[PDB]
Symmetry: D2
Subunit: 451 residues, 4 copies
């Protein structure tokens, strides 16, 4: 038994929607009314204390048009025989399971009209297929569906928890403790969680993320969120960055903290309320992009990636290099991992001429894959020429020549990135940040704003 | 007129306390009862709708011992004559201002005993000095103190706002918008703010931070928080880091993101609930430490600093270097900025021998200031020998020799810090993180835990 | 269709009780808890909004012993075919009416145990006989019993009203208007009424009076109250006297207002709180007793009758007399109406000798029916010798000789009854009222007190 | 000290009213809003918990016109020195009692305007005369008027009780017990009582009755109600009749129960809702009228008196008679008690000729005081010719000739009044009751209806 999907046709803010499910579902978003009414739809399906009051006039979509409320839940009941819950649901049914090789089982809610006696009359049915459903046999005030499930609702037998906004009047470390108790522990096998706090998602795994969109009409995006085997050692700082990234609409994926220093200076000199409108700067370091990108893509969040063209030397060999910054974007568009590039380099002068011939080989590599770079730029993936300091030299290079007394300011900024980045931020004006922001190689910051 | 201090002697959780004030006071902490009763003490001093009900038996410290409730507020009323509020308070008083060259004015609340008629009888007095106070003359239900001030209390004439927990059922960007409206705008000249969210302090300036301690007895620490003129370009990312650091008890100050990757791997292999007990990793990059350290020191938060011995070359000259990592700790202990150190370096071999002779000069500089290093280590300031990769080589250097096929793993890790740090984290065990954590040059992580 | 009886076995204050019913039932008494729980038992039988909440632990008689709640209602459904409600109940049933010549139909409530899941599970059944009942077929939240009846509950489809205490914050004439609207008008065919006010029963006819007794255990007495054809001209002053008599426990039935003056003087000189303990003086004038006596007997109220031996002359004949005061008590014990007694009286002296020979003939009639008088006295019926002034002469006759200056005070008191009764009350002492109250011919006043 | 009057000028339903007071004040009527706002005016004068909230906009008479609320209470403080409350009020005042021979002391409430700050600011003053009042000196939240009095408000130090509607959900004998505890016992020296039940006034003495009239404008009538020394033996049945008479508007004062039988038959054959509109039949027997008439006159209730011309023989003498029915109406208009009338009567025929010559002497007495009878009829006092049976003979005498087979039906009805009155009621039609009601000697029943 594993919760597959719930079909909410007619309810307070729903028309013909499907939400895919698994166990441990998490709903979040900016529409508070849809996050309330999703848990109210689950309480009308599976709790006696909400279903015994019936339907009012307020819980209809249009009050005279499409007057048939249906909630259908999908269970997928064929599983291995050592599971207790599969036997506990198949023992209660008698003729609702018709053929023993069937796989899918439905719990179908139906309602009648409201125009006479001002009442809903919720009617619940069982069966293995959608046509020829059979009524659930009850005798008094207790249905036979109520002898299977149990619902506990938390606000500040197969057991389904419903936790609504647990961060209210709560400290930060208690929210991280509640996140660790929710996902790592096996106390809560089935829940549905609504939250506004990113500290309640610092340890999340094997879960559905449900994002409710910011529109007035309810749009639901669902993702089967997992952390893979190679990502398990950098897992919780990835979850700490991504849990703050889940409450945004437009997210820029950067690498360094000095990039955050420079871009945040350019942002509060140009667009000083980017954090109010839904912008977020996400630091991604030392990993590939596609675990972030599949999560934000299936949750409907626009992902913008700014990256540099890096050359990585491998272990045990000298003079052979890997095309790392190409291969991350090739993994993002689903293509295969590229081959080895070897460069024959002498001893030469090691301080600057080796860096200059590596920059010239990166310039030739950026030249001969120009249509692939445009393909990446076609989306929100932006690959730099050599680095971002050399893209910064093409915009404010006279300013970098007049702040520092050195002749070459790019090498002086690359000698110590953080302290000379703070010295570049401190002697900077408004027109320099507009020269950075208006440039064609820093277009992605405009894609962070979008207005 | 400027709010100096409030003396709460007898109230629900107070004995003889003083809290220093300014305008725009912010109270935070883990004692919710003291943060409620501070605003209740201000409502009993300055609001009619709480003062007209009197005192019960529950708002006494001991119910039979020390039965004299006093709230005394300090105003410091001498100011320039173009201020409207100084004239609006000095026009109402007639004989309470005795001598015209006086500076300090008091608003003194007093209460009587509770053992007969079960009532408090709050009595309010004026005067320029603490002895020979005069009664405030009123006529009916309205006091003459009520013709000066006005109190608006917000829960989800000189005007004093009182905002209690505004982040409840609220989105993140609305909390950042409320922070920008609270501190940058001049709509709220006087307030007292209680919060649990770090996003309500992302733009804070010219304010009192009040930290209520985690003990059962109420301890109040207050700091006159300001951002100086040289720190104004890196101001709001400093406030974003420090606002999450204000809700912790033990804070480690680090520099890089790769240090956060390595230390966070060592932390969830050794002490996996450090974030639950009050630990926090704070990234400080490119700035001096003392603006963080004066704020956390006057708020009573233990600050732990891990830093490396850096040599910084200056602009316009070659072969002369600055002792930057010494001078940050010398600024932390209040000593003067050190002189210039020049090193005569030939052309040599630029790739490794220049780095080796710079490491040997840093080793000699760490040798000849050994008593200063112990002095720093005497507190929570920890200065590394060359870097933290060389301190990591002394603990897990056989592991770094067996992961990478290179002969020297320190130079390979310093070639690309982030990606080889993720490769060092991925091939790492429990005993390697215990070898890092048990070492004498990584003692500060134990100071992050303290248990 | 006509409501016959309700059998409440297990409920909050009931063990195996039966209450006989008709349409327009009225419940009254001093047990407020039983008058609340009777209407709660009807709401649990016939209202959806009480039956959907189920049973708690508090609505059981003993919480572990006799755990089977049964409410059975009797309908007697065979009637003439022009009644709409008989066809509206027989159209809904299909197989619950088995044989077409059956007369009695039952609505049977049943409940299960409470020791597991803390719930009652009310189960409702139909059928023509008590064994082999069939379940009421429903489909959702709406039963098929709910498609017949409708319950409106009033507190300050076949339609059943439930009015609980309508005299609260209400004027007296509005209570008399509500009584006239309740019983004379045909707006309320079916109701159940609880009241504390006697002005809500000033016009009552064709109704059940239900008296709940003053004990802690619930005792229900029911009477089919009607006013007959010969009593219809003196009907509403009889209802005004009897409606105040229904809220008492011990009621003395007297005739004159001068008897009320004398007995009320004797009562506040002997037992000054007789009205507090449940005593009531009821004036019955010009009628027979048995309409009062059948109502108070079937409602369980002890009726005490004090009466005089009267001789009534008939119309159109002279010298023949009727034994009226004997025949009222003979009608009370169910015996036949006695014959005519003729007395041959000359012209004589008309003022006193005719009254003396009529008193001697009444003394001979009281002599020769002595065993019948004892039979009446055996109950609470007390027949005087001649009048009550002559019984008053045997107790306080020296006091009546010393107040009035006339030789014969009985004839002077019978000349003007009211004004000389006020003159006898005004010159009276405590020992004279104890001489009246301790006498053997005024024992019935002691039967008014009983303690 | 004795409460004299309260002057409520501006309040919710008051303009310039005076209500005279004593101790033990009782307010009753049909305006529930005025009975609520009288106790709210006393709570605003004398209770801290209502006065500390101030005045809203709703408790003004006109919201912009006559914006000065004044409540002035009169105390009359000069009394004998053994009274404790006089010394307890004169000890608290210091200069408010100016001259020691003064008698009257005032408690003056004043209020300010409401158009700025939305507040009332109740100001209380003391002094011996109405001009040159002095402020009551207080120090904090407690006034010095609050150190004298104490107010307890009951809803289902000098101590003032306020009991509002205590008959709600209460039995009848508990209301009579509460009446006996209120007036006979000295537990409640000062109260103000509002009620709707006549059983809470069955033992009332030494009290103010306040009747609030049925109009929308508040009219207050007050009477100093007492029972005199000669009326003390018939006191509580007089209070039982008069307490039901206090809740009516038009009251007919009759004598016998047979008059109630006949008039109540004529009333439900002509005006069947006389009890709904405010009519009441009051039985007065054996007493004079003026104790009822002074109470109903000072309470503003229209009193209608129907009486017969009676001749009363005195004690110890024969042949001399008293003009009783004249002298009750002469006491009602305040004239002196008339002399003795002697009639020389022989032995004659005692049965009918003595009654005929007494009726002829009553006819001559009704002839020679014709202008006095018209004077009585000028008001609502109606004196019959001989009796009311002889006035009934002039209207329905052919009906009385056709019901009874006797030749003279007046003597047959006067032989037994009650049983032949029930026989006259039983054989009666609608046109006979219209012949009674339309007659000029039964005009007072029309004065009972008035429409
Ligand atoms: N002044 C310079 N002129 C030319 N090349 C330089 C200069 N400084 C540094 N480089 C280049 O930078 C490379 C790396 O620098 P190096 O290993 O000497 O460390 P560093 O930055 O001088 O040391 P530290 O970080 O301790 O200040 C050198 O191999 C050399 O090619
Ligand atoms: N294989 C090596 N052997 C010895 N020294 C090396 C080696 N690789 C790098 N270095 C040292 O590191 C210094 C800085 O490296 P360099 O400027 O050549 O960039 P890089 O790390 O090779 O380039 P990129 O970042 O594009 O991969 C050199 O001046 C040299 O002293
Ligand atoms: N003084 C008396 N002595 C003897 N018998 C009397 C006396 N007074 C009245 N009676 C008797 O009472 C009977 C009825 O009284 P009657 O008809 O004379 O009226 P009343 O009571 O005198 O009149 P009223 O009611 O007008 O005062 C008489 O027939 C007579 O037998
Ligand atoms: N049939 C009659 N004819 C004439 N006068 C009568 C008649 N009956 C009664 N009376 C008058 O009524 C007066 C009072 O009546 P009386 O004393 O005889 O009592 P009663 O009414 O006959 O007795 P009881 O009340 O026991 O029936 C008599 O004195 C007489 O004058």
């Amino acid at each position: 038994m594993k919760f597959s999907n719930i079909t909410i046709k007619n309810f307070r803010n729903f028309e013909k929607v499907n939400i895919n499910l698994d166990n441990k579902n998490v709903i979040f978003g900016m529409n508070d009314i849809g996050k309330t009414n999703f848990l109210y739809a689950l309480r009308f399906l599976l709790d006696k204390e909400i279903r015994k009051f019936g339907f009012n006039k307020s819980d209809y979509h249009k009050h005279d048009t499409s007057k048939k409320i249906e909630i259908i839940l999908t269970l997928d009941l064929s599983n291995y025989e050592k599971d207790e819950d599969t036997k506990k649901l198949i023992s209660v049914v008698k003729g609702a399971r018709t053929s023993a090789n069937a796989d899918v089982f439905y719990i179908a809610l139906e309602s009648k009209y409201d125009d006479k006696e001002l009442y809903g009359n919720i009617i619940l049915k069982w069966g293995s297929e959608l046509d020829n459903l059979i009524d659930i046999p009850g005798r008094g005030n207790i249905n036979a569906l109520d002898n299977v499930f149990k619902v506990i609702y938390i606000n500040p037998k197969i057991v389904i928890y419903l936790i609504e906004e647990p961060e209210i009047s709560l400290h930060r470390s208690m929210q991280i403790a509640l996140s660790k108790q929710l996902f790592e522990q096996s106390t809560y096998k089935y829940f549905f969680l609504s939250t506004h706090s990113p500290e309640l998602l610092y340890e999340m795994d094997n879960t559905r993320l449900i994002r409710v969109h910011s529109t007035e009409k309810v749009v639901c995006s669902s993702h089967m969120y997992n952390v893979e085997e190679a990502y398990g050692s950098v897992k919780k700082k990835l979850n700490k960055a991504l849990s703050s990234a889940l409450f945004a609409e437009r997210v820029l994926l950067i690498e360094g903290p000095s990039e955050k220093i420079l871009f945040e200076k350019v942002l509060d000199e140009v667009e000083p309320e980017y954090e109010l409108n839904g912008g977020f700067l996400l630091e991604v370091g030392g990993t590939y992009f596609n675990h972030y990108v599949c999560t934000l893509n299936d949750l409907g969040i626009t992902h913008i990636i700014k990256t540099d063209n890096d050359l990585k030397s491998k272990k045990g060999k000298k003079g052979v290099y890997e095309l790392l910054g190409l291969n991350r974007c090739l993994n993002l568009l689903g293509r295969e991992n590229l081959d080895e590039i070897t460069i024959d380099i002498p001893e030469d002068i090691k301080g600057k001429k080796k860096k200059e011939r590596l920059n010239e080989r990166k310039k030739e590599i950026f030249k001969q894959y120009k249509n692939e770079v445009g393909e990446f730029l076609g989306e929100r993936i932006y690959l730099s020429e050599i680095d971002l300091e050399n893209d910064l030299y093409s915009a404010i290079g006279e300013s970098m020549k007049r702040i520092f007394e050195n002749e070459d300011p790019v090498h002086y900024l690359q000698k110590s990135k953080l302290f000379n980045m703070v010295e570049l931020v401190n002697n900077l004006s408004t027109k320099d940040c507009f020269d950075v922001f208006e440039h064609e190689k820093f277009a992605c910051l405009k894609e962070l704003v979008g207005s």
